[PDB]
Amino acid sequence: MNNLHRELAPVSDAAWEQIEEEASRTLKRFLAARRVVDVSDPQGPAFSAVGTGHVTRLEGPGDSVGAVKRQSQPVVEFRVPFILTRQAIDDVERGSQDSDWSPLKEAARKIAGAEDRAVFDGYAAAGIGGIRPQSSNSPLTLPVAASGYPDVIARALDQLRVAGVNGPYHLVLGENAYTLITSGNEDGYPVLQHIHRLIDGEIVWAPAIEGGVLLSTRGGDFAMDIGQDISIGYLSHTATHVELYLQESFTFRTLTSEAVVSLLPSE
Amino acid sequence: MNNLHRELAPVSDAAWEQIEEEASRTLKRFLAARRVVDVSDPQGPAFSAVGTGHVTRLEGPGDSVGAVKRQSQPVVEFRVPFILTRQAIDDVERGSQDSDWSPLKEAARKIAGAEDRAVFDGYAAAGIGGIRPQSSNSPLTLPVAASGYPDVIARALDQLRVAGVNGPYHLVLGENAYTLITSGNEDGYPVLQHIHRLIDGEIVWAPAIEGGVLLSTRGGDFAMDIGQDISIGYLSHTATHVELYLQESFTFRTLTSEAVVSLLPSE
Amino acid sequence: MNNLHRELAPVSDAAWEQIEEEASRTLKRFLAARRVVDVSDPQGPAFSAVGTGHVTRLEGPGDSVGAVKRQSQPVVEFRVPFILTRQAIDDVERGSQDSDWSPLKEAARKIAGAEDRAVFDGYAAAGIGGIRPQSSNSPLTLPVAASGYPDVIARALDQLRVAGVNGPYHLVLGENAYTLITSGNEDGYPVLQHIHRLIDGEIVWAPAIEGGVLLSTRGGDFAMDIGQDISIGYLSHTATHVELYLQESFTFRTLTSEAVVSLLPSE
């Protein structure tokens, strides 16, 4: 028994397997920051802070003794609860293949959105700066039409090159920008082929954010330290419902501020 | 080369050996808290914080997502500089055996006193509570005469026993209390033999503190996490002097508040 | 110990490794001439001149004795100093991953720009003619719009073909020309695919120069003799700063003047 009191839940093994498969699929579909960010192996439940290497001067203890305090970034824990109806859970053992896992999918969407917004836009309460607000390059506004995309991307690339940043360049686009770029132009311009000539991978789809980001994936610029990966735990149950939750524990740091350019949503 | 730029100092190998021997001797004579406290092995220069296991509720990121921040205690660094005259250093290679290492001894005394006062009386700037102010037992005042010592110690022991605390019981006394207890009584009372019948070790001498402490050394109550042990580093030199420093890096936590009784200095 | 007195710098091994990694990355991102020019292996610190094979007639020593002096091109040394704050250096040993290496990056940019401008535009003081001013072909002006690029490149290629020059043909473009060619056209013309049909490699990005160059990389036309590759050396330090420098030692000769066509920046 660990803090996820899974054995206390009135949930059969087959129902657990189906729930885990659904959660993994939905999270992999929704998680965008993990595709362009250095993700460490899970460091365990005891992992509590990451040392930044910097110090802060203190008022001295006394006679000619100087003191400095080491600085660190704390780890944050995200939890999202959801409720299953106990009819979907019991139907699995009876051979059901269309049990209602919608609350689990909504919880997965919520937690993935929270994680993505913390990594990209920042979470001030947890001490997470965010990739975009902590960029030293000048932000660029996205165009209204898709034909304007090759012009912006190129300029963004130039900034990276002028900053001395190397390595593959990856583009992350929000829902509106992604659907605008992928829906084609009515003038027959092949903007998609030109963009894929400029960028070094598939365009990443990010439902949680607005606008976009062009960033280097050489490694060592954006560190995501994982204490606990997303896992399912049990809270309580009634005669007709079961309380579960999705939980993760992580911290994020931006190490190189010149390795990312933030694209603002079009006006 | 590490942060202690020892190879940049105009100091010969023999002088380094003599300096290290003197520092080790003086520190072992002056360091008192390390005799009654769980001291870990040095954890390296990167060691920056210790996780306490507790969490603090945050304002949520958004839609039905709850967040908690892990709590930790930061590591503190103590540095004390001292100056040698370069005549004592050069005389060592010429066969000197009475080179003046007084500044080194004074620096060792200063750093040992700072460490002891942080561990026993607390250091608020570094987040160190201290053993005595974080005691849940009622403090006892020490007597004016040595004959009163067996009465106080026994009562202190009773408190520990009433608190359910087990394990060997050790007494740490400041300079005045130690010299009063060891100087004998003029009535022929053997208070020392009675005290050694009550306590489970040698009395610890603590020049840095006033009063005393009676505490259990069963283990697991007072944790001293060492990042860097006391070491000698180099700062700068002139034609006739060398700047060195003594440096240590640690954090201290009191885990069991009922396992110590603080004895106040006599009035 | 060599002329780069690295052991005298108050810099730890980890800080040295991080500094060298950053310098290598930034230099590889900024160095453009080395991608289209024959670069020799480093010939050592004693390498002082390169013999051109030609002679100059002298006034004779005396009775019916004729004298000729061998001609050579001297080697030039480039040095760029920069200052680090000693807080970034010391933080590395404490686990820092975002130490400020901006002065190093600016020095790398400066030295790469000086090297590139010497190789392409020439450096009269060092006796370096330069690739572009020493071209026997007629220079071509670049167009204002990207659509005009296939017309110019083709004509430039024709010049090479008319000159009897063979081998792969490579295009080097300055920042404005590169960003204009890569930003696409608003008429849907695929100028990039046509250009890559005409040229025999990736377009080289040269932040140091204006305009461009189309040149053959068959080998034996542009010789860069390296005495000392770019290296980091130490000058001096204060209590809060360290003086380092980036240094290189080389000479450059253009051997075939008909193997390059210089493209002038657009007006």
Place this chain on the structure above:
Amino acid sequence: SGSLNIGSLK
């Protein structure tokens, strides 16, 4: 135990 082992998707 209990984790989905999503890890890195890069």
Place this chain on the structure above:
Amino acid sequence: SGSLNIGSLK
């Protein structure tokens, strides 16, 4: 390197 290795004196 450079430490005095005082450690624990208990």
Place this chain on the structure above:
Amino acid sequence: SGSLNIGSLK
């Protein structure tokens, strides 16, 4: 010793 060994990038 001390060089970055950039060499040729062709």
